[PDB]
């Protein structure tokens, strides 16, 4: 069965069709890279609301809420992207938060050499998570582990306690629901440092483009880059 803790995490998940329709409208309302900056900016709004909605997170005071989000926003962006490929993804395509399916080689061209490399690394993680049978229960657990980081507080006791209970619930779930997949718990946690390295490289690239004058007006994205 599913631990009750994970059932509460699943309740915080955004309504996927409504998020798609909303970001779709925003983009329909400029380089392709510039359009993706807009798409990421809108995704960050959805991420902030997700955490704001969230059990546990909504108990922290604003100052603590800001630190956690400033520390993991890009990691959550990449993790969300990766899981989106795991579920809705196909070979040689990229699925966007707007619901669009684009050919990888086309969007990789538009992304340039550097970004294509990071996108390709992420696709490697997609393939590994698929072979591990990564599912939605495990996904929401990783999202909260990324959000409630210990490497970041007025209430470190809450953060530490959330981290320990989510870890225990994820171990219980993977052991009980994928017992033939040996060490699935550890194999999932291994990907968090990998995703974080990708997100650090992504931030440095976007920060470079911003200083270079290539990132159009996106106040939330830019503010998080300056955090």
């Amino acid at each position: 069965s599913i631990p009750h803790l994970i059932l509460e995490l699943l309740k915080c998940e955004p309504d996927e069709p409504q998020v798609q329709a909303k970001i779709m409208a925003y983009l329909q309302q400029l380089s392709t890279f510039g359009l993706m900056c807009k798409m990421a900016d809108q995704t960050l709004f959805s991420i902030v609301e997700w955490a704001r909605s969230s059990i546990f997170f909504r108990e922290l005071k604003v100052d603590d809420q800001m630190k956690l989000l400033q520390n993991c926003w890009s990691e959550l962006l990449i993790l969300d992207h990766i899981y989106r490929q795991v579920v809705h993804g196909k070979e040689g395509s990229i699925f966007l938060v707007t619901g669009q399916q684009v050919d990888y080689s086309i969007i990789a061209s538009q992304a340039g050499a550097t970004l294509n490399n990071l996108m390709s690394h992420a696709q490697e993680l997609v393939a590994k998570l698929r072979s591990l049978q990564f599912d939605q229960r495990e996904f929401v657990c990783l999202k909260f582990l990324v959000l409630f980081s210990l490497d970041v507080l007025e209430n470190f006791q809450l953060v530490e306690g959330v981290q320990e209970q989510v870890n225990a619930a994820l171990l219980d779930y993977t052991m009980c629901n994928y017992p033939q997949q040996t060490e699935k718990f550890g194999q999932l946690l291994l990907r968090l440092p990998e995703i974080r390295a990708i997100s650090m490289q992504a931030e440095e690239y976007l920060y470079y483009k911003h200083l270079n004058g290539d990132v159009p007006y996106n106040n939330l994205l830019i503010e998080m880059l300056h955090a």
């Binding site: 709004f45 902030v48 604003v62 809420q65 800001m66 989000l69 400033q70 106040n219 955090a227």
Partner: peptide, 9 residues
Amino acid sequence: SLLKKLLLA
């Protein structure tokens, strides 16, 4: 801060 504005709403 826009982020702080979002969290205070």
